[PDB]
Design a protein around this ligand. Structure first.
Ligand code: RBW
Ligand code: RBW
Ligand code: RBW
Ligand code: RBW
Ligand code: ZN
Ligand code: ZN
Ligand code: ZN
Ligand code: ZN
Ligand code: ZN
Ligand code: ZN
Ligand code: ZN
Ligand code: ZN
Lengths: 266, 266, 266, 266
């Protein structure tokens, strides 16, 4: 009579999967992902750091762009994550197999990564990806140093329990540039109020808005570039319209408050 | 220009996903999966055992058929696996979350289950599923006893390194029935000779043919029923045409030898 | 010349290892550990819950006391933890092997449990125990229900990142009794200020004092009974001198402030 | 009355813990462990390989000897294991935290490593150590190549299910030297016959004797040097009395047959 449905892969907008050549953000920091998914390469004299990798099928493209930058597989030392959803941590397992890279993440992100995004608090098994293990667990405010670039973790739970902003100082034109890679603050299709799987969701989002507002932030980047008004396809003006961290937090909070009101009405 | 491809879910023949009501094999043993994927429920006075669950989307159907048999979620004590591919272990993680069940498997199956079938020796990441942890590691020839039914593991590596046959004795018409749930012996699209990820593949398959030939085997069942000539949709004659274990092993070896010859020619 | 030192097991006060018979706390709640380590059995019509198990060598004693209470290994459904140090989660792995029990814990506790307490933020590898996997990850404020007893998690990070208080309502003399199993608030030998492995340690402890002060709390119990002024060897007056949650929090904060001052002076 | 016993660390002969300076075996291969535990450093132009690390407390000594050889923590690329007992894999977790090293092991060794040697088939929880994750699972006969040195795995189950011999070709005096690092073939205190946790133990040991006898083997090394008649404290004559692989296998089989006969008589 009626068979059970076939499994459905989550399909994304084509721009999320559109390869781009490396785009320089600061002296050591490059966008090497796709037009609409951030994957940041930070290059140091002592090896490279990758912050996010995008979707699972982006692994080979990332390695190609690393090679274009002078980074061989052995040179990739560290993978950091904004959060462990399939569209940001998708290729981590494959990257670990193909490079020297080790993963550092907080406990919440580590457990979600280790189950490949399955049993998501909001999406169930709808967006799974290959599981990976974290090599180092980080705590809030902990620093990790690679070739003299210091990365600081700032927990900003909400979009996932383990959502993290990463900050570091690079240079540009001889002057320091405080880069803030702030995580998503969206809640796409989430039940916000009275969620049995995330009872303090609203409190965590409100704290996370405050955390983002206060980040050291000359340049804001986000996992989805549109969230911070980056346009990676716009070349020399890709970052011209980027939001401040304050503006990003304010916009996210206004959207969140609207969603809460609609949820109450729905 | 050209975006990377969207992820593709592996889609299966519709009969693999066609629910069926429980079909009794022996006094305590029932097929509760789909028309073309085996999932065996063994019911004892001390709880139930599930051998395989089929595809990931079959979890709720399995629980429905268990309930029809008098088995509540708390009553499911043990999940055993033939091998940890998505079409047999697919729903294990969800079943563990929704029942009291613990998983027993050999080390090879446990590591493949824990990575959700990713980095498959032959399929890469093409057939992933939600990862799950094994609660007990079993060795070759080890027995597990549930409510007085004794299950014996017989390793038969090849289709996966961890492929296992499970045997137990049930009853029918007052007489013992030695049931052999023998794993797949297919090698679908595999590189058999000189495979760097499985150097002794051919030797393992040949040993596994010999293991299957020698199993205690009044009734053979297989994860794909067609492999042992079962027809789960045929009601009272579902098992009438079933192969012996000897015939199953011989047929698998003849097919394997043909594949080897074609590989040499290709 | 001089060999490396032998490994040293952490040895504890003998009272921590002194078995005791079950001591009833409320209609369904029993202390079944040792004189100086709490292990709480909550018995319901639908199976039993264990909160903490004490030291690794306590597994058989716990099972003996469960049997004395009418709880067989199959009847133990759930293990909850205060925190995943060796003196409270020590026997969890063995209990999972020997019972039907599944573990529910927050992500921080799950990752520490899965590494058997190794690489502790403060103790390094000095207090390891057999690793175990969590079956369910809980979020702050999440409830788990067993046979109609509702357990609520209240995160109180500090002693470990994953430290949790568990609350439930039992009965006594026909009246509700709100039981609070609050975790340790000690910091034994910890570097409190400027700790690179726990940068927000002090902030987390201060929040945890406030959490404990506000718990629903007719009866306070603690992993080390002396912390809440229980005397499990005192029979019918074991709980007579027990602190309120408010008094426990106040005492812990005063001790913490003294330790901070001594650290500044040392 | 009588408290439960304190945990007992397994204490080893002092020579197992006696540090030694690096002892050269061949052009790229050095013993860097203790007088009575092997830990082999293989140095290549593309990074270093460590085969075994000895006991848990040896991590810092290993890193000191690596530094003496010109190998920094970032230069250690790969850890291979003979088997995952505490006296050979003890420091692996710490080495992974402190170096760039990734672990490659077979599935049996990986699962035992991941539980820190707990629930050992023969020793129970008597010899635990800090758990570690494997980064790569290897199959029998699989090769791993580092800086042009090719390591081949030869499974030799028995002492543990995952016991592995590793072979590679180095040079000495301009000529190839086929090095065989063969695992332990002892069965210390094991129940050999009818062991429910290892039903095919005897068959596996007999196959492993045959595997060892046939290894490519100009120079045999073993995890316990005395098993192959090495004397690491004897300087320029440390390896003079070393057994062939054939002689090692024959001696192990004669000892095994004697143990079997004593077990039958006991
Ligand atoms: C679960 C995954 C597959 C998923 C699916 C679908 C959407 C998202 C978003 C998301 C939501 C809103 C905006 C608009 S905006 C100006 O940024 O508010 C953006 Cl750009 C992205 C995110 C995310 O935020 O990570 N994830 C999604
Ligand atoms: C990786 C998964 C998704 C997959 C995909 C596609 C096919 C299979 C088979 C398979 C092969 C041959 C036969 C014909 S026959 C009379 O049995 O020789 C049968 Cl029925 C099944 C198997 C398996 O054997 O498990 N798995 C497959
Ligand atoms: C790491 C483990 C093995 C360990 C070792 C040693 C001590 C503890 C304590 C601890 C500290 C203070 C008090 C005095 S008091 C009135 O309670 O402030 C108490 Cl009772 C217990 C704890 C703990 O609190 O869990 N753990 C310890
Ligand atoms: C479980 C651990 C802590 C343990 C404890 C105690 C002994 C061993 C041995 C062992 C056995 C026999 C020989 C004598 S001989 C000439 O080699 O036959 C040797 Cl040297 C070593 C081994 C091992 O073989 O790995 N492990 C032991
Ligand atoms: Zn997301
Ligand atoms: Zn996203
Ligand atoms: Zn298969
Ligand atoms: Zn199949
Ligand atoms: Zn503690
Ligand atoms: Zn304690
Ligand atoms: Zn050993
Ligand atoms: Zn040994």
């Amino acid at each position: 009579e009626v068979p059970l449905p076939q499994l459905r892969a989550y399909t994304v907008d084509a721009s999320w999967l559109q390869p781009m050549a490396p785009l320089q953000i600061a002296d050591h920091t490059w966008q090497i992902g796709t037009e609409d998914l951030t994957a940041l390469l930070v290059q140091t004299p002592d090896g490279a750091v990758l912050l996010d990798g995008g979707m699972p099928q982006m692994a080979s493209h990332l390695l190609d762009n690393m090679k274009a930058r002078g980074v061989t597989p052995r040179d990739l030392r560290l993978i950091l994550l904004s959060h462990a959803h399939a569209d940001h941590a998708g290729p981590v397992a494959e990257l670990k197999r193909r490079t020297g890279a080790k993963v550092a993440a907080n406990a919440e992100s580590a457990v979600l990564l280790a189950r490949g995004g399955s049993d998501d608090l909001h999406f169930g098994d709808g967006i799974t990806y290959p599981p990976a293990n974290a090599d180092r667990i980080v705590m809030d405010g902990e620093v990790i140093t690679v070739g003299g670039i210091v990365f600081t973790a700032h927990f900003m739970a909400g979009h996932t329990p383990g959502s993290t902003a990463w900050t570091w100082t690079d240079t540009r034109n001889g002057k320091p540039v405080r880069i803030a890679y702030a995580d998503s603050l969206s809640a796409p299709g989430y039940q916000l109020q009275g969620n049995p799987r995330y009872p303090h969701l609203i409190e965590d989002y409100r704290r996370s808005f405050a955390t983002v507002r206060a980040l050291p932030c000359d340049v804001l980047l986000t996992p989805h570039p549109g969230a911070s008004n980056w346009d990676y396809a716009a070349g020399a003006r890709a970052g011209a319209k980027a939001l401040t961290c304050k503006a990003y937090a304010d916009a996210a909070e206004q959207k969140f408050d609207g969603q809460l009101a609609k949820e109450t009405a729905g």
